[PDB]
Amino acid sequence: DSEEEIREAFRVFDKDGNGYISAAELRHVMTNLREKLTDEEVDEMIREADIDGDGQVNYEEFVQMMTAK
Numbered sequence: 849d850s851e852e853e854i855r856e857a858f859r860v861f862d863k864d865g866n867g868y869i870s871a872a873e874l875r876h877v878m879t880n881l882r883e884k885l886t887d888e889e890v891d892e893m894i895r896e897a898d899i900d901g902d903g904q905v906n907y908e909e910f911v912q913m914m915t916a917k
């Protein structure tokens with residue numbers, strides 16, 4: 849709901865600083881943000897979050913990542 853909200857989270861989610869997050873990288877924060885998760889639950893979420901299906905999530909796609917499903 850805020851342009852800054854997902855923006856500050858990018859420094860928390862993207863450790864490489866390259867502008868994109870992958871399953872293994874997302875898992876690192878997801879296991880603390882949410883519980884009852886397998887590695888596969890993260891990957892299912894990537895496949896549904898990735899609007900263009902290329903295996904990575906950029907800034908605009910990150911907003912959609914959390915509003916998907």
Ligand SMILES: [Ca+2]
Pocket residue numbers: 862863864865866867868869870873
């Ligand atoms: Ca990254």
Ligand SMILES: [Ca+2]
Pocket residue numbers: 898899900901902903904905906909
């Ligand atoms: Ca993508």
